[PDB]
Structure formats: C-alpha cells, structure tokens
Amino acid sequence: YRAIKGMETKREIGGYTYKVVFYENVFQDSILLGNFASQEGNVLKYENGQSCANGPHRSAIVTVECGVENEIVSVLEAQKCEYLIKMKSPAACS
Numbered sequence: 001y002r003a004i005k006g007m008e009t010k011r012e013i014g015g016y017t018y019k020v021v022f023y024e025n026v027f028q029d030s031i032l033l034g035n036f037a038s039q040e041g042n043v044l045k046y047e048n049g050q051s052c053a054n055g056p057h058r059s060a061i062v063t064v065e066c067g068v069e070n071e072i073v074s075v076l077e078a079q080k081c082e083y084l085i086k087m088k089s090p091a092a093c094s
Contacts, residue, residue, distance in 0.1 A: 009087065011072035018075055020085060025049065026060040033060035033083050042066065042092050052081030060085055066092040 006022030016028040025035040026046050034046030034057070047059040059082035067088030076084045 007070055007089070007091070009070045009072050009089075011075075013072070013075045018072055018085070020060075020062060020072060020087065022062070026062070026083070026085065031058075033058045042094075047082075055081040057081065059083065062087055064088055064092040066090065 003024050005024050006020075009020040009022070011018050016031070019027045021036075022044065023036055026033040026049075032050040034049035036044060036046050037048070038045050042064050044062045044064070045059070046061070047057060049058040049060070052058045059079070061079070061082060062085040064087050068090060070087065070089035070091070073086040073088070075086070078084050
C-alpha cells in the first residue's frame, strides 16, 4: 500500500526545485509535475500530476541514458505541459 521511493534526485531549475522520486513522481518545489505510471524503455513517464492551467495535466518524462551518478541535467517544458527531464544514473544500466 506504500509507494517505494528511489534515490530522490533534486535539482534547482528555473528557481524551483525539481525532485525526481523516480518510482513515485516528480515535483517542482511543491507543484507536482506528473506521477509514475509506466517505464518505457529506460525512460520513465510521469503524468496526471498537478494541473498546468495553461494546458492539460502536467507531465514529466525522465529520459535516462545511465551514467556514473544520478543527477538532473536539465528539464524543459517542450511538450504539452510535459516536462522533459534529462538524467542519468548507474542504476539505470541493465
């Protein structure tokens, strides 16, 4: 009944703190981008989050290429209130 969290990667982009719980969801300060729904490849998709107001539901898509450590490289609202999260992590290698 309790969601399991990952490593919690947090980074300040645009003045707000992006938190990637990885197996839960992603936030910006306290504004919920999206929620972990599915893992597609090595990319995790988070949607049904907090409203965007200027569009549909916010969403977050974490693109992981794997690396030495987990870190939020960048986040970009390029898609429909859907935030591209660019990351890497050794735990992503499989």
